[PDB]
Amino acid sequence: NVIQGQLMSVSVPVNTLVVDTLSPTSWQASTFFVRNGSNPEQDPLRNLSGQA
Amino acid sequence: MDIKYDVVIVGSGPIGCTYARELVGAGYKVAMFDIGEIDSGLKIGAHKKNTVEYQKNIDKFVNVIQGQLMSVSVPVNTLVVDTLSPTSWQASTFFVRNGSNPEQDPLRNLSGQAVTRVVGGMSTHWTCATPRFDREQRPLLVKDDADADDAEWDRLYTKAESYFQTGTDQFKESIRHNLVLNKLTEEYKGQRDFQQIPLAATRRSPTFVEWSSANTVFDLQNRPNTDAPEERFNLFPAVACERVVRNALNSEIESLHIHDLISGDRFEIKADVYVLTAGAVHNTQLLVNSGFGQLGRPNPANPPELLPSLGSYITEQSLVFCQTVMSTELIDSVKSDMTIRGTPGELTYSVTYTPGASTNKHPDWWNEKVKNHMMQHQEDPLPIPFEDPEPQVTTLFQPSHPWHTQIHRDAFSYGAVQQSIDSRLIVDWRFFGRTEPKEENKLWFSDKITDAYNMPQPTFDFRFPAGRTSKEAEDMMTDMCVMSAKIGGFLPGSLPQFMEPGLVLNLGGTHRMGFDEKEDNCCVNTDSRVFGFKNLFLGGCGNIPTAYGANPTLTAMSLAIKSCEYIKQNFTPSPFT
Amino acid sequence: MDIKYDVVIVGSGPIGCTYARELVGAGYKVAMFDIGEIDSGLKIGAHKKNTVEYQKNIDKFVNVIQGQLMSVSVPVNTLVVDTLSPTSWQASTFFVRNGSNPEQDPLRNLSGQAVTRVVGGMSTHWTCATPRFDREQRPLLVKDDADADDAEWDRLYTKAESYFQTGTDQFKESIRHNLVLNKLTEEYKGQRDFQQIPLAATRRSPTFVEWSSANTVFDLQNRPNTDAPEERFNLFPAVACERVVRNALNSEIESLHIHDLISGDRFEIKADVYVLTAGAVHNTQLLVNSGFGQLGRPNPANPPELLPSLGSYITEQSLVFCQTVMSTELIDSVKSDMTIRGTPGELTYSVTYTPGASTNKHPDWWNEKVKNHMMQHQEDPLPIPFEDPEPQVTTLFQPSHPWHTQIHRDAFSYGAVQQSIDSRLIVDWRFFGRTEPKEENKLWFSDKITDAYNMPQPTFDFRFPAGRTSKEAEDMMTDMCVMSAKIGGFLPGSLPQFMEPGLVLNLGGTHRMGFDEKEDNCCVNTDSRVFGFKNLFLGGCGNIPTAYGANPTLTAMSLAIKSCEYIKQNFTPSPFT
Amino acid sequence: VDWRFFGRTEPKEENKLWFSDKITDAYNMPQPTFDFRFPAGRTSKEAEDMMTDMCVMSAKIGGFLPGSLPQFMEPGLVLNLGGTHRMGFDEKEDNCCVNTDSRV
Ligand SMILES: *Cc1cc2c(cc1C)nc1c(=O)[nH]c(=O)nc-1n2C[C@H](O)[C@H](O)[C@H](O)COP(=O)(O)OP(=O)(O)OC[C@H]1O[C@@H](n2cnc3c(N)ncnc32)[C@H](O)[C@@H]1O
Ligand SMILES: *Cc1cc2c(cc1C)nc1c(=O)[nH]c(=O)nc-1n2C[C@H](O)[C@H](O)[C@H](O)COP(=O)(O)OP(=O)(O)OC[C@H]1O[C@@H](n2cnc3c(N)ncnc32)[C@H](O)[C@@H]1O
Hints:
The structure is cut from a larger assembly and holds four copies of chain A.
Chain A: H1 2-5
């Protein structure tokens, strides 16, 4: 836990995971926009995703 | 096979079988085609859970369901796998892989939508809940005369109920059923009514319920035969129906083009009357492949010549689910009338009640069952008999609670932790919302991508409409949370949740019914006849143009019966040759 | 139902059907009973994956398998759920709940062991791998004469292979198949031989393989009929066979006691010859229910009067599994003979080869399929055709690698993340270990707990023996890790693993064969006749007394053929009157 | 017992750490971006050979613990990144940033 708590990811690609079980009243974007500190420059397939 | 029939039916689901029952019985020479195959035993198109093995191992049935539900539209997968060996081959893009549909926006899908290609269709696995729609949910059959409309619907529904063997008595003596029904009756006294879910089913024994199916409606046996020597019916399985051929005037269908999946041969089948009962998705596909509507991505700067409302105004219900573990109060109440003497497992253990006593909270039949269970199984900590049938409780859709409800048990895949909880404690909660028909909600078909049968690939463009539909959906979630708490707390791992869109499989309005094609934005009239066409009829949930929460099959069946009445008045059976 | 037959067979799996084929064909009046029901379509007892829909949606078939595998013995569940609402009822103990078996030590179980109760038994869903055993794995039929023993096996196995339609040719022009086969052949040149897995199956088209089943062996249609006007056979589904009645002398069976599950009535059926082919578990259960062996927990202080070795020396195979993702080198090698000009998607893109070129690594049929795929699907990044069949590769058991191998694809439920990997890249690895027969490894039956059909509850006492069995199992794991690396790296989510004990469903030795009841610690002789009994025969994998890694069904069928030769020489068919 | 085997990776010009001219990190500094694959050839072959070696060697001590089966870890989880500002004798000839005194 000490290790995980001080390793901050270097480059996180834009997340394209579909959540489709939200309530119909919850706000949803129409696209996978740049969210939550993700890096839109990052090709998810040419990354070091574990680099921290 | 002949090239010529009086009536050809595409699909052997319960709606196809309604046409077959009516029209075979009226003396028409009928052929029915199904892309799927016979696989329910000797009773063709029968319910697959009516084997002794599934009556004894109910939850294994969830595997049967899953094994015959094929996803309608799966978007391109973009999940990163970055723990492959450096030696393994990898593409540098998320390419079109594994039957995925590149037309599909993953954020405007019905991901849970699936289809069943077997003889008997989805009626070989369905839950068999067959409520009537109240006026608020129900399509109009007579305009500007509510009593005449009500009378027609009562007539049609009563017949549909007879065809399905719908009843509300099959679980009447279950302890768990009455424990739940009685508690909810009391809690909502003066506010809501509760009853048994109307079920298409016949009880055969204390531990066997024969669930209804396509086979209940029509046995699907070729005719003539010994029981029906004057009737004419052929079923042709493993035949893909690919299109109906329109005349140039768009006033008549000229033939049905079929692909025999075993031989590989293609034919034109000819009939006087063509009936499409291939389900809400595949009726639409067949029509679009026949030149109705528009192939490819919707183009409002270019609406289609024929049936411009086809595949628009599509509806799918919101579904919320949880499971609960019965309260200590309710469990203890089961044995409220008992006098319990001794300690369990010893010779001095006694469990007794006074039959008929006026201070008894339960009937004698209840107390006898509890007494016997408690005395015969003194190791068991619960007063509910081991073979006690499940609850099947509903409060039907009303304006102040505009959702259908099922408070019951069906086949479920319990996780290993969940199996730690005694199944007698567990109750399923399914609440179903109604969805407003909106023009922008669509089912369309690719002009480039094809499905596994080489037919134009179905693609959804769907979101739950803002406004009433969405508000009601969230209100419905809250309602399930409030009501379920009267019975017990949530079962971990089955916490209150919206199900993936389309998982509910109550899709409607893909080929919707109305009085006037233009004014009511519709595809078929109240006889289920395709506008403009003398001899083409559609059957199924796809005809339903309303926002409905209740399960739609009984209503679709009622519409098919009315359709058949028109057919009998307008087409003459061939003389039996 | 008649009261007397020449032969009664309990179970309609492939081994029951071997006795039916032999004995119905020989003119005997045969009855067959199955506790399960007809549910494979019109071809009674046929393979459920032979539908067009399952040939197009192959992975959905895992659901069919799961839906008809009922666990043999589930120990009491001790998993803690401590996040129930305070209002929910809870017991203070992990009491006997949900069909669990309180006799079962969870640490000495075959937890993956399961049974299938349907007409055709497990051959309705099996993988169809039918290798022969080499001498090392094979029970003796002739003592002290290796060449006679070899000759007898070859005869029997050859007939069995005709019954099952076993072949090694059905995947010969698969690119994926030959890609793997060739690579492993080269890697182990001089060390091991590779070939196609022998498969009970007939290819019908490039995209359809008709898998064999019990129906292949014997079609299960009542006789006499038009095709077999002088044969006599009746099949009685939904009949639980409960016991065989022994005479006072324990020299003859006098009747079969049955329970008709539909009517609920019990009857005694008379025959000259009684054959039990109810599977390794249920043969043993029926025997113990009939007074053979010992009911209850095994007890050396009180050994059984009849068949003291029944339910001892049981064997189950170790199974290890992974999946791989094809190496870049192998994928690139697929198109090694192509000259590729231009840019995909454009006018000038060109993929060509020179037919017959002496420098080509691949044959013309291969190069033609690759060329057409690459030219017709220029958006697709892989050279493997979309409809290319799966690999079906083995190196069979040998002393230097004493495990069976399958390097293939069968139906599998892929996770969402695994679905991200193109299916053409994926190969399944299954290695099967042999298990030494040990007296302490037992299948026994409770004298207090009953199963869902009210029969004594099966209980395992099993561990993989120390010594050779365990060392070989671990060596086998390492061998899979080494061999698989030649093809590609492991697929995440399907890393190398031992499967749950008994998930493999290759249980043997429960009613084992040998020459001398006492010396060979066995239950049946080499004619599959129960020792002491003139007219009682057992069929199936339970007869197999050896340590085997290869799939046992073909071997069990070969034993049943030899059994039928005995029966034909010692029992006279009734006159067809 | 834990088993961790660490492969060596050939330095290739195409494997890059670069910085966004538009996106910034939590300290408002140019956002790091990787362009990385394990090089074909020796690096990849040895990585897979390493995997097998772990499988073979570990079997001498015991079988795999369920839930910790032999696997490649997510790229960079190992946290042994090198060569981003690499040393050599001659800036051009050795394609490098610092000399053997670590001087730019
Ligand atoms: C799957 C399911 C469905 C279900 C349910 C629970 C489950 C898990 N619970 C229900 C409930 O409790 N009450 C209710 O009213 N319905 C419930 N359902 C849904 C119900 O099964 C369906 O609404 C009903 O079966 C629809 O009937 P219909 O006859 O219209 O359609 P189908 O059953 O899907 O049959 C269609 C068939 O036609 C075939 N087909 C498809 N395409 C073609 C082509 N091109 N050519 C020839 N035949 C075709 C199919 O193979 C099929 O059999
Ligand atoms: C499940 C399975 C099986 C399998 C396989 C893959 C799976 C997922 N792959 C195999 C393979 O590649 N090669 C091979 O050799 N075997 C493979 N198997 C196993 C194979 O299916 C079995 O070994 C085979 O089916 C055994 O045949 P057998 O005829 O001995 O037994 P059965 O198929 O289990 O059928 C037995 C039947 O008898 C009935 N029964 C049981 N109890 C009773 C009673 N009391 N009364 C009347 N009938 C009874 C069953 O219902 C059943 O049908």
